[PDB]
Amino acid sequence: YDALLLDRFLDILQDLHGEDLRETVQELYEHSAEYEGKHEPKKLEELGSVLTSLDPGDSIVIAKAFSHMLNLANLAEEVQIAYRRRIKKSDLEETFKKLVGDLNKSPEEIFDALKNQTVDLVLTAHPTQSVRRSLLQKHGRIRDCLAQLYAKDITPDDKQELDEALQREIQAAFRTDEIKRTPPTPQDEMRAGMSYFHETIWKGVPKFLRRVDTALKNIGIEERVPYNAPLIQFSSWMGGDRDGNPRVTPEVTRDVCLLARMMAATMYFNQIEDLMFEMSMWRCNDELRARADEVHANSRKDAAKHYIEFWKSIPTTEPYRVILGDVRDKLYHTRERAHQLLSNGHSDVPVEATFINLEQFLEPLELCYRSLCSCGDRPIADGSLLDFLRQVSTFGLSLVRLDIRQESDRHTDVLDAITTHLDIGSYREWSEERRQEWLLSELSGKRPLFGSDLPKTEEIADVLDTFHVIAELPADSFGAYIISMATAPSDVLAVELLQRECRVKQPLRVVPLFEKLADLEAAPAAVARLFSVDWYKNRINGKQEVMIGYSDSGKDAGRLSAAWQLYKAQEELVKVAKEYGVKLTMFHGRGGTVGRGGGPTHLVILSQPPDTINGSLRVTVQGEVIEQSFGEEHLCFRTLQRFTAATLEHGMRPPISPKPEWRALLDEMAVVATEEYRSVVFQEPRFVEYFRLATPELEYGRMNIGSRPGIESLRAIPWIFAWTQTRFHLPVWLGFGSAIRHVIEKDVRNLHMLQDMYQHWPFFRVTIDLIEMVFAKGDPGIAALYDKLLVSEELWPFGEKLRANFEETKKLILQTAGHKQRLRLRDSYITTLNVCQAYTLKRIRDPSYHVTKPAKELIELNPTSEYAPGLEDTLILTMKGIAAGLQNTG
Amino acid sequence: YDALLLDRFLDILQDLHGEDLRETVQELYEHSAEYEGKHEPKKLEELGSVLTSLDPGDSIVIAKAFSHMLNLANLAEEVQIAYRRRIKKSDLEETFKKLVGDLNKSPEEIFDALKNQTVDLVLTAHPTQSVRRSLLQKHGRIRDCLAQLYAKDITPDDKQELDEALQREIQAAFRTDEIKRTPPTPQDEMRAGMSYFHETIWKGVPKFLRRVDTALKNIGIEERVPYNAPLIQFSSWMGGDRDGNPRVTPEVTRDVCLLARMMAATMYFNQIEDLMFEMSMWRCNDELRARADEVHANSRKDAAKHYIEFWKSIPTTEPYRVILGDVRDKLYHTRERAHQLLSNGHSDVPVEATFINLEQFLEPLELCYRSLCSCGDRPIADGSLLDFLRQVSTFGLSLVRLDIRQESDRHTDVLDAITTHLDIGSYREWSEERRQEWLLSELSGKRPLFGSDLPKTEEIADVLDTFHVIAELPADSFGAYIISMATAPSDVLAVELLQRECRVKQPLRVVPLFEKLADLEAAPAAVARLFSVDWYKNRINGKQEVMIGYSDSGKDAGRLSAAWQLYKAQEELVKVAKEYGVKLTMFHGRGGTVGRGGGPTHLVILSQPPDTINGSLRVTVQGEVIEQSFGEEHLCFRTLQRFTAATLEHGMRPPISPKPEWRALLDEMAVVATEEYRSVVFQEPRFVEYFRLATPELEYGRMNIGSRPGIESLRAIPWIFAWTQTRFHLPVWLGFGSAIRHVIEKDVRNLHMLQDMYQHWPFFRVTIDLIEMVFAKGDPGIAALYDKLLVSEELWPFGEKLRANFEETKKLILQTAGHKQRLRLRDSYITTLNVCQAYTLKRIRDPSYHVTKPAKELIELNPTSEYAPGLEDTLILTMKGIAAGLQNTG
């Protein structure tokens, strides 16, 4: 079945660049097949020799070719998955049955626990999406074609037109420049973000909700999930996260908020006329009759000719249409107000003529639902009206609530500017106690703090002006204020005060970020200290959110020690929240790659300590993962199912709590594992050098993915990227070797205790299984070749040391899991690109191949290349392709 | 399979009005089943006795019930048809094969004849659509549900959710008031009209075109139909036809034209961003490169924040996106200009910033197509870009070109006002010669005719002001000026002059309407006289359109004589056009019912005389027929296929031309048939009386269908309606009895000549077969019962005379066809309603049952009824239901 795509693509490629190039591509495919089969390391050089011959443009064409072959492989994978799963005629219905049978839980327990369950998915613009949007669209169309082909109801002409469509759409994909030639703006990132709504999420949410209703009815629960029950929500960082991104200005946040508002208004307006058409009943209760008579009293006997449907005054014969008609007029004026506010600087639209409340919108729709139920029309109510209620209660007036992020030291800079200007001292130099005392006195105080005449840096005015921008806009457009590098309560109190002082009418909730390992060790203490403050615990009103970073933890210490300290951290934070009677929601800053805390969703949810969620979970969806989980109706649904099921099960089926022996064993194991990790990544004086030679880290910035302009000082994203490209994955497995070996050395029964832990502690099982996954996607011969081609003869054995540890560690990993479906083939493609990526790097770091109108061929596409004409494009193509093949960037 | 719908509906009905009403409905269904089975006329009275017991509201519920059961039957019919035809894995591919095999015609002949073929479908607001739009939507949803159920890939939960959807949507259908309580405005009619575009036609056209491309490729023609080849077009009368409709004012025409323009702009704008996303190539020819450099020169380095996608200035890396980007800016400014022009009286949008030309739009898209083909991207060009080209070239800047219709005497009134005001005589009193002479002298003249100070009636100013309104608006928004009751050339020259004098910058083509039988007899002569005028033949530029009415012809004379004079008329008109070297296109004013020239499309096209079409055909789609042929993707496609196939075959496979014996035989037969028809419908002095008693004609106006406020003096629509409701169909078959009997009496070999004609003359075959269809949908027992319940004892035998003729005529009909699939059952339902319609009429025409807040039950729905509270609603319900059951209103 697989050979279909190869055949079609190679045929098109021959139509575009000749038989010769198709033959050389086939030669590469066969050499790589012999490598991923026989694994003779000579085969890699044998392929590279074939590669060194290519013309400057021909090599570009080769990299393009294997890249698009990989992408096609991913799409066929998704389709074959959706079909293999659909031809079944964890899982939602399965999870209900297991909760009833296994645990003897009742249906009404499931339903009541489900009403009080919340999952807040927040989308982020983290620079991990390798593929440009201009291509992602074509990907969507191609997966649609392959979806329609994989069926046995094809009618001849449909099949031929679908072959023409698939061919023309592949060719259109190949005819686009893959290289972002300029990096995007934050607003472009927000556009890429919201695209998944008016494409998949907008219609995807109601369908998923209906499916939940169906499942509850298969359990015997005729009742339906409340439309206002908040089973899912969406937040976004796109355009708000300004941590280290000076390109995200206050006006950027304004722009994206007005944008989202206008989008929501538009979608609601396109829907509202269809809904009005359907709501043509004449029976209603006396309540809705009174209301409809109200609106028809001020119905304004006017033309209203701009409208398409229902342009005439709406008769009382159809009352639901009257109420919905006012809903339309307010919706129209909303879209028009936002439309002018965005196009120009202003609108003449009066705010009373718009929806100002999250639920001045909802109230009339609720009234409609009540009326329908009163008259025996509950089936009618649970149709388009219900879908519309759920859509309103879920996306509101601005599709997502936007988070604003900033580092503590910027708040500290603003405050120190204020105390210096007030001739009272230096907030910086002040002890944390002094800071708390002053901040408290000013929060309870009633006098304006600074005035118009406050001296402001560009930075100071940046943070102040983002606060003013928050104040100027509606409250229901924002989510939370996230403080990076939060250490003490003064860091949060600073934000609360700055909000109040910037006249933020309804200040938003403040939430800290603990991302560095030390900050996580100290986090429960610092949160406890914050809850100690009687004023702040009084203002927080029994609810508090705190974020837990996964990216940087596993970067400065071992991956293992990161995970274990993360489990401990969640546990102890829940301890503090329970002690102070405050409902904690924990915000998990997970990535897509295991190296930044990633993994399959239900597994990483199961690996959280029990009684730490309790119907409140918040998770980052890091850029690239967004496309992975919302680019198709099926993907969106499977994602929402996976998340909600994992949460409900983790609620009613709490994972086992560890025995103390396992606790201490993990503490020792973590000391040894961290010493193992830092021994190679920081003690070795030549390690940074070898890293800057053997991995493609430094070139990452050339892909122009995001808008953000030693090894401790780099972002975690190119860190896991660099080692994932080379298929070595050092930051995933490093400490495990010395950890397991030292633990077995100290005591022999520790092997029986390891076998005990792998089969009974969910967190440990998840960890080891994930490490086994990562080993399955690795090949040390690759790292060997990179060393052979780019690393100087001197420290060749260093990598070999690592290569030793690699195998050694793998031996231990399987040893705890007790291990010893025929996908393969794709690695062949990946292997080819690996070779291409290695040799090309060698030519880039040379003096002969350095540099000292329109475009009608690929080589003319990069004129501003400081390297040789055909090279930079080829390297970027290799990185893109390998990422897409491994199904992970960083 | 049929019993499914009965089961679901009766279950819902029991949930809504109790077991008792479901049982009484079942009783009615069984009695009607025994009638449509055994046909004992006692069964009708036996059912009526059961009906006389009902409460006032219960009878309303019964009529509602059988009406909705009938509608459900129609929908299940359409679905079972689409499935029965789809499970085949005339017709388009069949027609190609028959044209090649049978007639030895070549592929390139088919393709070249197809390039030069045109079909102009014009939609009309004729008051024949019985069902209110508020219900038609629910019909659409229900046929979607039944479409998804009829498949064997149902997944359990999908089936249950579809049962909930079908149930809730049926219930929503039943919960709406079926009675239009106020008749619509012309603009409401235009809204109902255009709804089929932004629902079915807009996407339906490109799919059909692609299918034609596929068929041509299965013939060996790799080439694709030119995007600008006009294989289909759309016109509309909605909002322009003012013949006898004083509610259609000039401002109405303005309103609907600005409306359509805004709609088109909207649809194009929603599409344009997706198309821009796909057109991401970097290769182009030097032509398009030069153009893209032009637009990027004035690209206006500006924010353009109102836009969603591509809000930033478009780079030259993606040139197609640049050109399409300007296309977007002009499209946006167009939608906004029309939007303000409609909302208020004006717009500040400059006309240069909009598309003013039908093809200032098309030119950049053509340039894109050329570029794509130049670079080997013809597959890409034939995708979304092609669909978009065809959409532009087919719908233009205002979805349909609107026709304006008016009677000659209104033009005559205006002119006579002008000559009276000029103190030169009376245009009315003038001989046709004098009229022609003066009109010619003024058309060639250069002086303003009337001035500001012309005395104008409300009527005079109506016609003048509609001319000014035509002049004020863009030319590509209108189609043709249709003159009702056209008799001479002065009638057309009047319109040409009135256009010129009203400063109509690009005057539109004038086209006459010959609808009365005398006007059709005299039509070829009058058209010849018009072509004689050297000036007008010079201005017409070798193209002329003339309309041929079918409605009124078969109303004043026999149906047969109508058809035969119609054939003669088409033939002789083509004669005149050929003689004067002018390309004639004939505009066929056909209805949906056979009584107004209706029938299955390919049959009524085959029954046109050969060499009368020649790649130019224009057909009315009378209101109700619109829903019948465009309410579903499948219906729209099958309609466009049926029409285009019938036309192409009638072009390359000309139907046989009649022998002279058949000509004269039809002339005699037509004299006898017309004498037969007028003998009963006009000679009988009591016929009008019996018609006003035995048929529901007079009550037609109560259905509030359209916006238009002896028997010779009524519209043809309630004429065929009245006889079709009662299932008697007198105007379809009347003259055939005496015609055939006299023809066989005059000569015995005329029977052999009739058998000869039925098997070899397509027109005659179509006629007899249609009459046989109409007999199949008739039941004389119904007319008997109506007579028994409403007609006075005196002229009871009169109808029986007719009933004699009926059977007698039927005997002859089968006798010429040589005749002697198990659908039935639906007639049972229809029969019930027939009984309901009869008895209820009797109670309405009584003195006891005549008349001398909110609403919470059906009886409160008609408070302004001059008849008894529960009655008027019941009658209207019967008429609606019977119409839907017979699948024809009038």
From Swiss-Prot, chains A, B:
A Pfam match is PEPcase
Tissues expressing this chain: Expressed in all plant organs, with higher levels in roots.
Coiled coil residues, start to end: none
What processing steps or modifications follow its translation?
Enhanced activity by phosphorylation at pH 7.3 by lowering Km and sensitivity to inhibition by L-malate and L-aspartate, while enhancing activation by glucose 6-phosphate.
Q: How does activity depend on pH?
A: Optimum pH is 8-9.
EC number annotated for this UniProt entry: 4.1.1.31
Regulation of activity is described as: By light-reversible phosphorylation. Activated by inorganic phosphate (Pi) deprivation and glucose 6-phosphate. Inhibited by L-malate and L-aspartate.
Predominant place of localization: cytoplasm
Named from the GO MF annotations, one term is: phosphoenolpyruvate carboxylase activity
Active site, per annotation: 126, 555
Q: What are the UniProt keywords, alphabetically?
A: Allosteric enzyme, Carbon dioxide fixation, Cytoplasm, Lyase, Magnesium, Manganese, Phosphoprotein, Photosynthesis
Output the Gene Ontology cellular-component terms: apoplast; cytosol; nucleus
Q: Where in the cell is it found?
A: Cytoplasm
Q: Which reaction does it catalyse?
A: oxaloacetate + phosphate = phosphoenolpyruvate + hydrogencarbonate
Question: Where are residues bearing Phosphoserine located in the sequence?
Answer: 657
- In the UniProt record, the signal sequence range is none
Q: How is the cofactor bound?
A: Magnesium. Can also use manganese.
Cofactor(s) annotated in UniProt: Mg(2+); Mn(2+)
Q: What induces it?
A: Upon inorganic phosphate (Pi) deprivation.
Q: Per the UniProt entry, what are the Gene Ontology biological process annotations, in alphabetical order? A: carbon fixation; cellular response to phosphate starvation; leaf development; photosynthesis; protein tetramerization; tricarboxylic acid cycle
Family stated for the protein in its record: Belongs to the PEPCase type 1 family.
Function description? Through the carboxylation of phosphoenolpyruvate (PEP) it forms oxaloacetate, a four-carbon dicarboxylic acid source for the tricarboxylic acid cycle. Contributes probably to the adaptation to inorganic phosphate (Pi) deprivation.
Subunit structure of this entry? Homotetramer.
User: What is this protein's name?
Assistant: Phosphoenolpyruvate carboxylase 1
Gene name of this polypeptide: PPC1
